[PDB]
Structures are given as structure tokens and as C-alpha cells.
Amino acid sequence: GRQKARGAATRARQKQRASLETMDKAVQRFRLQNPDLDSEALLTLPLLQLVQKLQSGELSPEAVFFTYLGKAWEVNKGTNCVTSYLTDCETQLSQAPRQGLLYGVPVSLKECFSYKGHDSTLGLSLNEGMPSESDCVVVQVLKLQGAVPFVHTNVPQSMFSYDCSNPLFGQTMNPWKSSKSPGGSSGGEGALIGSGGSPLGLGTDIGGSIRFPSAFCGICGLKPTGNRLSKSGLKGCVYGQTAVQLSLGPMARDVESLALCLKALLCEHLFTLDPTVPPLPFREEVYRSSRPLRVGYYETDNYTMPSPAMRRALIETKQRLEAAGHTLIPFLPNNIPYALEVLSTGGLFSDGGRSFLQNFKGDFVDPCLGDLILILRLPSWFKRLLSLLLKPLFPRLAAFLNNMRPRSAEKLWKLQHEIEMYRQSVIAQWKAMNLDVLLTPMLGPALDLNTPGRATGAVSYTMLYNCLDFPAGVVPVTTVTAEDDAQMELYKGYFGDIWDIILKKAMKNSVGLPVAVQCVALPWQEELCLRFMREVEQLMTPQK
Amino acid sequence: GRQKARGAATRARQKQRASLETMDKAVQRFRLQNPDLDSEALLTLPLLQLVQKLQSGELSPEAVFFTYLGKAWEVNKGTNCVTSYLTDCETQLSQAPRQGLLYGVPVSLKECFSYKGHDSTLGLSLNEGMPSESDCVVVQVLKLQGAVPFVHTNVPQSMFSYDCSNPLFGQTMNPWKSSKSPGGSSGGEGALIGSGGSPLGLGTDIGGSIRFPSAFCGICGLKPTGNRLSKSGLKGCVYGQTAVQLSLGPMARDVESLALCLKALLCEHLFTLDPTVPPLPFREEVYRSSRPLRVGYYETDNYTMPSPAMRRALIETKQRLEAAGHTLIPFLPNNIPYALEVLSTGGLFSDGGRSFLQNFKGDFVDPCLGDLILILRLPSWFKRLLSLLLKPLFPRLAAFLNNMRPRSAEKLWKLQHEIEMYRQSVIAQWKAMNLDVLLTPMLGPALDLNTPGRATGAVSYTMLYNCLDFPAGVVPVTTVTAEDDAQMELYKGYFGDIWDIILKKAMKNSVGLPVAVQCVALPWQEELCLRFMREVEQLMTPQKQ
């Protein structure tokens, strides 16, 4: 009773193999025509310089394309981050608009970004052999700006997870240590970019899916305000859930790259292709500002106890910001627990899981999802009874469980109203301390494989800003030291529930892995957030 | 068990009388200190010139304030459009920021725009004696730009209606003919501005509530894209309904005024007070463009048969645009009936009316609501049975009724998704014909009092753009002729149901009343819409430019 699923996995395994084979052939042929091309010099250029050399004509597009293509092919051996080669892109190379802001840049794409003639499976058998009739809007805009989307990258099954495995393409691994998750759901992009095989990628984020893989794999990522960029044409799994919106944004090796991507996407082409997006140009002057900042900060969210590395990262960044002349102010958004347990959970699962679950009918469940699916299928009443049982022991479990029940349209209105007033509440705190930006810990170091779907509470640092729909980005600032890692033996967590226990074991054995912080600004202030991210980058990682 | 409602109406009647008295006193005292002030010269200035003279210091703020105040007090006699005098505002006059874009402009405000120390009752007894503890965001921005909000204006009970009566302040009347509705729910503003007693006002719109009273009272109004301006601090009655969004926007006697209001509100002060609003400045160059336009048009929406005046208005505007060198293209959004009956109705009433109905516990129901409330209180199952009965006879009635039922969050998701795809479908048609803007009929002439709440189908022209969330404005272009009015005897409507029958009678006896058209652009293109509206104004009514 699983024939479709097995068939799907087989076809998908075939298409992946054949893609990688095609890539290999093209790269090998290119290398024999061009033996005297310093490939490693090219691959290490910062994107901004790559772009400039592509504009001047000092580097051909073919040279940049096929060098990255080889590099991608190579890093994929140890990572399994590539699902498909976007076959028609050698043709796109030659047609690439010449004064485009990203002329000749190979760009990687999370699998959900629809591409003409390719599946966006999301690891789900339901969506195998259903190729896309057209490119999604942001892909078109990337093309119109001269970029060359060249690969689809892997995602955890359904994309609802901060790990990166599915039953079609299997398991993506962290390029810093193969026992570790690369993060998710944009984990493919994090593994690729973070092992040096794509200079620029796009991902999506509803609970942290740009920020986890960026932080875990040691790269920069930005999740904008939800309707700053076009979601039109993106492949999804739940339709019409507007309480917690989905956002999309760039991942790259430096902050300047993320700014360039935004500057390039926020142009007339996007605004006329999706008029539902407000036509807010990129404000150069705000991104380049060097005025002192008033910076809110917290060391812990009092929900997910941070690892010693997180905490050291946060504090060091804080101190260096202080020394560079910024004012640092303790700030914690009010009622985090209710924002996570009631608003975030209730909005993502207002219908009890029913619509989401449809995507899994007849399909296997990748074990990286843990018991999420099992739990969602439970009758409403039993979720309630179970919630009453656990409440005195493990109230956090009891709260997530109870707020995953189905409900009426009337209660969804009340919930949407609460989401709105919570948003206004935090804006008011922020204005009362007169903050410009906010600095927070970011989950890290990378967790062991198959642990993120058993440490749901650890989304606390990131999901808060999906609920608030504030822009939020991450910047790698240090690496785990032997000291940091030994200290994990003293980690206990605030709740002592299964999610605290898993997280403790999961963040262990992590010496050498990157750790980040998170930078947040108010709605529609992507440019300021990037400015602050740019500053954190200069102060903690000067050599670049 | 009606005592609180009667008490409420009595207190509210008192506060309204006392407000009007205070206004009268101040105006009379001002006139005697300043006998040599040409008042009528001042009242007829176009806003733009008013403003310029206020900036140069050729006219003092006191002079402009008190003159409008007297005019408001006077027109209110025949219209009952003013509920409260915003008593604070003589002290606001002297504090008014000098380089503000609206320095010294008196501005009228629909009752729901919260003002510190005044009730926003919405005609509902539940909200009487509950004064607002702060100004709403747009009122603060108006103040920071030097404007002087001076009155609250009347609304129909709950604000959910295109008529303008309630049990607290009573019934607002059209200043062109007192047997007629002024429109609503921003009817107060329409009656006040339209009788020359406020140069600039703000209203709100969820099914047409800026565009009805603007068209019915002969003034310009614009309903922006829903999140172009801040709704923060506005007084409502339903919370969390996001499928069909509420919008707010200006009403004034010319298009230029509406542009100035937007230019003034879309400023740092608004963007920092409500960061949820995208900080899209007013694009002067787009509003001032004089490039030819590609203009979609339709003459009827095939749902609400237009009155002969509507139809003449639409066609004349079309022809004049054609002669001015614009291209006119036939365009009708797809599936209007489903947009109104399923998406619009379902999104406004996804919970069956229950949240809305709460606002009416223990309160009288203004007869200008008709049977809306009675119908909403009906058990879900009886709404269904009734819907199945009427379907073969009067399918339109059957559809509105069935889509007012409660439902789960799962079905609301599906509805929200359909709303989203509907929005994209119409964008795609628009792009396939390569339109810049769209010209449509607008409901008119004004209906008889207590008829709008029995002609629900007639919101078809306006509500379509609340569902799509496109900017949409109205510009008066002509007046009902005796020929137009006689033709109403030939009006049948497309359905022949009770809504068609009521509408026929209700638009009769309307000679001399203004009629408008509607101008629509894509989301976030308020400036282009205003450019088009400016063009329609120029061509049909050259004198206001």
C-alpha cells in the first residue's frame, strides 16, 4: 500500500542522478577548452567583486558559470544538497541582460521556487512528476537582472522543519561536519553556499527557515517582512493561512551580497509582475548610513536556554558594538510564550493540521519530522485530554498541543486580532525604549541530524519574528571552542521537558562549528536591518 | 429592557446640542471681533489656494477656522451631519505646526476616527460614554501637518450600511434634497463637505463607504489600497476579519484636495507611528503625468442594472476621454457574481454574523438597516433551508443568504485563498489588455432615505474593489436630467428580485442630483488613480481646475 511513494522516490532518484551527470559532463567539457583558468581565484571572490568583473568583461559568464557548476557538483558529493540541475540555463547564460545588476551570477534556488519544466516536490510524492508550467516571479526578476539560476536545492519533507531530509532525495548534511544538520527548511542552500558552491541563493522562512541553515552552515541570510517580495508562483502546501505569513529572502556569504540581491529584486520588473507587493525601492542611503544605533539586546529569551557558544557570541557582539559607539539596551519582547504557543502555533495550525496533512496521504514520513505528523492526526478531543494531562508536568508541551486544535472562523478572527494587537504591543515597547534595531541570540551550533524535529521549542528565537513579521537576519560571528562545548554538560534548559533534553544532546560535539546572532528591525526596514547586519559583520569578522 | 438605549440616546442628543451651541457662540463672537472679513470669498476658495494663503500669512488660521465653523453649523441645520464639536481645537489652532502641509486647514472626521476625549459611538449605545483615550494615528498626523480636525460627522448605525441614520444622533440627510440619503457610511462627511462646510474630510470604506456618499452628495472621494494608510486607533465593531480589508481615505470638493491629503498623510510621522504601513511616499511625478492612458471601461457590471443617469455619465466620460486622446478598451472583471456572493459576502460574514451582532445586544435597530439584523440572527440551518427554497426564484437572494453562514477556520482558509487567486486573476486580465486604469459606473443618483438597506445588490459597483483591494475613487461628472429620471419607469433590473424593485423606486424623483463615475488603478497605485480622476474632472467639469 505504498507503490506511488516508492515510484516517486525512484523517478526522483533517477532525475537527480541524471542532473548531476549532465553537470559533470558540461563542467568536464568546459575544463578541457579552458585549462588555464585560475578556478580557485574565481570561487573565492566576494560576490560584489565577481559582479564587477562580470560587468567590465574581465570574466566571461561561461567562465563563472561552469566554475561554480563544477564546485557545486563537487560539494554535493559530501552534502547531497542538489536535487536538480536547471537544464535550460546554458541558454540563459548567453541571453542574460547585460546591464542587469546580477549579470552572469549563478544563483541557487530552494526547491520551492518554481522553475519552468521542473518539479517542486517539496520531498512529497504527491508533487513528483508535476512540473511547473512557468518560472515564479522572483525567478523571472533574477533572469531579467542577468542572473543564471542553475540548481534546485534540497528541503526537508513538506518544508515544515528546520532539518533537511525527505524520502525522495534523502538527507542533506552539514558541510562542516556530516553528523550535523545543515538546518532548514532552506538547508540545501545553506549547505551549498556555505561550502562555497553558490555565491547567492534564495530561500523561504515561516519559523526560521532562512536563518537556521544560514547560522548552522556559517553564512548570512535575511528574512524580510513577509510582503516585501513576491511569493507569486512559489510552490506551497497550505493555502490561505494569512495569520503567520511566509517570507522569502537571500542567503549568501556576506551581508553586502544580501543587499545586492534585495536591490536587484526590488525593481520595476517585480513591482509590475506582482502589483500586490508594495513598490518600495531599496533605500541605498539607509543601508549605507553610519550613524550610531540604539540597539536592543537580550542574552536569552527565557524560553530556549542558549548554548554557551550562543551566549558568548551574543555578548561579544554586544561589547564590540558598544566599543564602536553604539548604545546597547536590554530589551525582551513581552509575552514570548504566548506568541509562540498561542499565536504562532494557532495561526500555523488553526484548522488542526488537516490541510497540511493532506500532503502526506499515501506518503512515507521522513524521520527528521519526528512525531509531528502522528501528533497532528490525533482527534481534537484527544489533543485536549492529552493537553490537560501534561499541563502540570510539562506545560510547554501541553500548550503547543492544545493550540494545534481545529476551530471556527470566529476563533480564527479572534486569533488574527490577537496577532495584530501583539504586533502593536511589541512596536510600542520598542518605541518606548527608543530602539533602532534589536540584537538577539540565534540558535546554534548546528544540531545533530534528526534532532530538530524533536526540539520544536528551539524555534523560539526565530519564530517570534515570523509572528511579529519584522525583518530578521543572521550573521556568523564566531566558532565553537572546546571550552564552549565542554560547558554543554552543564546545560539544563528552563523546562526540563523532552525538547530541552534533546537539545542538550543535540548541540554537543560541535567544536569548530559556526555560531551566529540575529539582527531585527521594524516592519519594512530591511535596509536598516542589513545596515546593522553589515556592522556586526565588520566588527566580528573584519577579514573577508 | 430598552433603558440603557434610551439613556444613551438622551445623553448623546445632549452632547450634540451642547456642541452645536458652543460652535454657535464661538462663531458669533469671532464675527464681531472681525467684521471686515469677506467670509464667502474664503469659503469658496479651492483648498489648494486656501492652503497657499494660509502659508503666506494672507489669511490667519483663526479666520479660516471660525468661518468654516460657522458654515458647518449652518449646513448642519438642514443635514444633521455633525455629531460632536472637537472642543480641543481652538487650542490646536494656535499650536499648529507652521510649515505643515495642511497648516490651518479645518478637517472633518468620520465619527470612527478616534479623538481624545470624545466617544466614537458608531450610533451604538454600547459605545456611548466610552471616550477615546487618545487620537488615532491619522488624526495625529493631520495635527503634525498643521491641520485642525474640528468635527465628528454622522454614520449609520454600526457603520455597516450605505445610508446614514442611527438611534443616537438620528438621520443625516442629503444636502441636495432632504427626501434623499446622503450615502454612507461616511455620510456625515458627504453631507458636510458637499454643502460647502468642510474643505477636507476622512472616511472609511469596506463596501463603498467613501464612494457612495461622495457620489450621492456630489464630491470627490478616494478609497486607497487597504494598507496604504494607518487604521491604527480607528473605532471598529468586528475584529480580525482580514479577507476583505477596511480602507480609509479623503473626501473633498476636488481631486487636487485628495492628492494633497494623501501627500500630507504619507510622511515620516505616519510611517514611524505605524510601522505596519509600508513607507511608500506620494509619487508627485505619477500624479502629475499627462501621458495618454489606456483605460478599461464597462457600462454595466451585469449585476446591478445602472440608472439611465449612471449610464449616460459613464458614456459621456468615455467619449471625452477618447477625444482627449486616451485609448478606451472594454473590460469587465471575470466572475463578478462569485466575487460578490461568495468571496465578499463570505469574507465579511465568515462567522455567520455573530461577532457583528454582539454590537447590537440591547440596542434598537435603526430602520435604515432594514432586515439585515433580523436576517443575520437566523440559525445557520434556517439560512440554508431558506436559501434552497428561494434558489430557483431569486438566486441572488439565495446566494447572499447561504454565504452568510458560519464555518470553520479550514473553510476560511480556503475562502482566503480564493480571494487571493481572484485578485491575481483580475490582475492578469488587466495586464493582458495592458490597462493603466479602469473606468466604471458608480451607483447614483442618491436613493431615498431607508432604501439602501433594502437594496443590498447595488453595492456591486463598489464592493468589487474592496474584494480586489484596488484603489478606487469617484468624481462627479453630471446631474440627473428630467429625461434621465423619466427613463427610470423603463428600469427593470437584471433579476427582478426585491433588491431590483426597491432600487427602481429608490432612484426615482432625482432630477438635479449629482452622478459620478469610478476610477480604479492597480494596488498601491493611488497616484495614478488620482491622475486619472484629475483627468476625468478636467474633462467633465473644467471649472474646478
Ligand SMILES: *Cc1ccc(-c2cnc([C@@](*)(O)CCCCCCc3ccccc3)o2)nc1
Ligand atoms: C508548505 C510549506 C511548509 C513549510 C514552509 C516553510 C517555509 N519556511 C519554513 C521554515 O521557516 C520552517 C521552520 C520550521 C518551523 C517549525 C515550527 C513549528 C511550530 C509549531 C509546531 C511545530 C513546529 O517552512 N513553506 C511552505
Ligand SMILES: *Cc1ccc(-c2cnc([C@@](*)(O)CCCCCCc3ccccc3)o2)nc1
Ligand atoms: C465596525 C465597522 C462596520 C463597518 C465599517 C465600514 C467602513 N466602511 C463601510 C462601508 O463601506 C459600508 C458599505 C455598505 C456595505 C454593505 C455591504 C453588504 C455586503 C453583504 C451583505 C450585506 C451588506 O462600512 N467599518 C467598521
Ligand SMILES: [Cl-]
Ligand atoms: Cl502590505
